[PDB]
Design a binder for this molecule. Structure first.
Ligand SMILES: [Zn+2]
Ligand SMILES: [Zn+2]
Length: 252
């Protein structure tokens, strides 16, 4: 497995090669962003413990969006930590249903249901131990998709970006999620405008995890400082999305 490691002081990667989970540590306890698959949860716990941190000290678990590869492990990690789960309303409703009634997937990819304790509204902030966590509503991939802005105790800004992907989604006359095109285009604009020091995302290949991890492990302390990376992720996503919409318009 990918061994857990420090992205930056107070910021730790505890996920797997593909599925992000990020631990923000503070003297007042910790914040975990995302939790992989249900099958990932034992490994994420082991990774947190291998860094010398306690599950019991995690105060909040924040979700990007309510698909099995980000929310699947939340039920278990919540039980082990006692953390309060934070998510947007739409993600909370989908988590309560274990991923079922998904606008594009239906019931094809369910996961353990979990109760969200605290809803997040756009721009809402939580403070813990010198760190500020703020929700950035970035819908499109799902109606409740959320990116997370973190102001660290040293003043650095971290963005944890959600998915901007629309895999197999009908974009024209989608009766289950009618506004998805307008939503995702606004999400591109919202993210590319963010001031950011450290760019992370909920899949390692979206932010160059493996290459940056290798450089960091070999002494490049600023490997995860990537001020233009979020803009580049948006640009790649926009190009693919606009090609997708044009392709669907050509033969609807
Ligand atoms: Zn997803
Ligand atoms: Zn994912």
């Amino acid at each position: 497995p990918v061994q857990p490691f420090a992205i930056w002081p107070g910021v730790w990667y505890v996920g797997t090669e593909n599925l992000s989970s990020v631990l923000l540590t503070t003297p007042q306890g910790h914040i975990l962003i995302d939790a992989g698959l249900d099958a990932s949860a034992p490994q994420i716990r082991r990774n947190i413990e291998a860094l010398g941190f306690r599950m019991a000290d995690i105060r909040y678990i924040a979700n990007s969006h309510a698909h099995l590869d980000h929310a699947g492990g939340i039920a278990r990690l919540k039980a082990w930590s006692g953390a309060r789960v934070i998510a947007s309303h739409a993600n909370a409703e989908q988590m309560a249903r274990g991923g079922k009634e998904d606008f594009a997937l239906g019931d094809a990819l369910p996961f353990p249901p979990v109760t969200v304790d605290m809803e997040a509204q756009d721009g809402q902030q939580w403070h813990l131990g010198g760190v500020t966590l703020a929700a950035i509503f970035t819908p499109g991939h799902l109606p409740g998709a959320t990116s997370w802005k973190v102001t660290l105790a040293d003043g650095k800004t971290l963005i944890y970006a959600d998915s901007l992907a629309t895999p197999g989604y009908p974009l024209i006359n989608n009766r289950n999620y009618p506004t998805l095109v307008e939503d995702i285009r606004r999400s591109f604009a919202r993210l590319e405008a963010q001031q950011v020091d450290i760019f992370l995302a909920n899949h390692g290949e979206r932010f160059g995890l493996m290459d940056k991890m290798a450089r960091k492990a070999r002494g490049e302390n600023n490997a995860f400082i990537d001020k233009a990376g979020l803009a580049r992720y948006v640009a790649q996503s926009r190009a693919a999305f606009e090609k997708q919409l044009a392709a669907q318009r050509a033969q609807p």
